[PDB]
Amino acid sequence: PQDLSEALKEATKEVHTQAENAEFMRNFQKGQVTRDGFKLVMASLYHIYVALEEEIERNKESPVFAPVYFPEELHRKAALEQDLAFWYGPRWQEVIPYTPAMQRYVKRLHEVGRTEPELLVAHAYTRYLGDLSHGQVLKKIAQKALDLPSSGEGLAFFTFPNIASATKFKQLYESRMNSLEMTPAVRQRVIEEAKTAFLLNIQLFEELQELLTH
Ligand code: HEM
């Protein structure tokens, strides 16, 4: 449709259905996942979110992004720091992995935040709305599999405490995305950047898959 929110959904249906077939994501999705694979996923998210939130901060007051700036409701860095401290220990920052696929993703986020700010919404959409939608099933799959102890940590990332209702926040976020002012060309590039975002994720999984199995 003409609403950016609906245009994004429709345009990424293909790459999303594709992602549901990426081995690593297939296995996780079907209950196949280990502590080592999970840790890798979490490390990935950490690096991705640090770069994403760094660029959102740089462009928070710009009209190309301000409407979708929800620091309190969406920030994920702090939750990932908590989780990684549990998964990798007190010196997690010194030992977490930083792979080519992770760097590739981070590189585009910075390129976008510094030279093509008008496209940052596409990356925020792909990450936030997605993680917000995959949250429940994933944390549940994690619990029922990882056989965690009873320390109450490691899964903070899957809970957005500052969002009372995910479905209601989704409406609000879509509405803010649709309030953004953009020319037909920018709008087109935003859609294409979203596809690029999915691809970065899909190829990140293909790497985590290659890495896990040796
Ligand atoms: C591994 C398999 C995956 C499954 C089973 C899955 C499942 C879902 C589900 C059930 C929704 C439906 C939301 C609705 O009710 O409309 C959704 C939304 C979404 N997913 Fe995934 N997903 C997967 C992978 C991905 C990946 C790799 C990304 C990108 C990191 C992603 C990004 C999104 C986004 C952006 C939405 C928002 C849709 C909207 O515009 O409303 N998903 N996903």
Side-chain angles (χ1 to χ4, degrees):
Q2 54 200 182
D3 270 334
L4 170 57
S5 51
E6 296 197 308
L8 282 169
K9 195 167 172 61
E10 176 168 346
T12 59
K13 186 64 181 295
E14 182 159 347
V15 287
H16 186 287
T17 291
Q18 188 192 304
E20 289 180 57
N21 293 32
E23 178 168 57
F24 182 73
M25 278 286 90
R26 298 205 303 278
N27 300 171
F28 188 140
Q29 189 179 181
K30 72 173 73 298
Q32 310 181 192
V33 67
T34 60
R35 287 203 172 191
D36 275 35
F38 195 68
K39 285 166 58 171
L40 257 182
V41 168
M42 299 301 275
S44 300
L45 290 168
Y46 173 71
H47 289 116
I48 297 176
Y49 267 110
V50 163
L52 173 60
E53 267 148 47
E54 201 188 310
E55 292 304 325
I56 287 179
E57 275 306 308
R58 185 204 310 297
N59 304 88
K60 61 183 174 179
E61 290 183 356
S62 170
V64 308
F65 194 86
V68 296
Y69 179 59
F70 288 108
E72 281 297 297
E73 297 89 349
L74 304 178
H75 78 271
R76 293 288 82 198
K77 183 166 81 72
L80 285 160
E81 287 166 351
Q82 293 286 329
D83 287 347
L84 290 177
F86 167 72
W87 290 113
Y88 286 92
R91 290 156 82 184
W92 63 274
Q93 284 190 72
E94 306 169 61
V95 293
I96 64 173
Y98 189 39
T99 64
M102 293 179 202
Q103 313 168 198
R104 199 168 301 137
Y105 198 149
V106 166
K107 189 172 99 75
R108 179 55 185 165
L109 283 162
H110 289 310
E111 280 163 7
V112 168
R114 294 172 164 288
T115 68
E116 307 179 66
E118 66 276 1
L119 303 189
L120 192 58
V121 56
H123 275 275
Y125 161 76
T126 300
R127 271 263 74 80
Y128 294 125
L129 258 57
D131 299 340
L132 197 165
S133 292
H134 315 145
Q136 331 66 200
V137 298
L138 293 184
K139 85 177 309 307
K140 170 72 178 310
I141 286 179
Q143 293 174 177
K144 325 297 176 181
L146 296 176
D147 185 67
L148 302 169
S150 302
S151 54
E153 43 188 53
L155 298 177
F157 176 76
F158 301 93
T159 293
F160 293 76
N162 298 145
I163 287 177
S165 171
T167 103
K168 271 55 180 185
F169 186 81
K170 217 96 92 306
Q171 307 186 201
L172 170 59
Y173 198 88
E174 282 169 9
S175 176
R176 288 297 186 79
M177 286 192 291
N178 299 325
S179 76
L180 288 168
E181 215 62 50
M182 43 175 86
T183 62
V186 171
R187 179 181 159 89
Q188 282 173 39
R189 297 208 302 278
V190 163
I191 297 302
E192 294 309 300
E193 192 60 26
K195 296 178 180 297
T196 292
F198 273 81
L199 290 180
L200 287 171
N201 278 283
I202 283 179
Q203 63 187 85
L204 164 66
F205 294 132
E206 305 182 316
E207 183 193 67
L208 296 186
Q209 184 45 63
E210 136 201 301
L211 293 171
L212 282 179
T213 47
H214 258 177

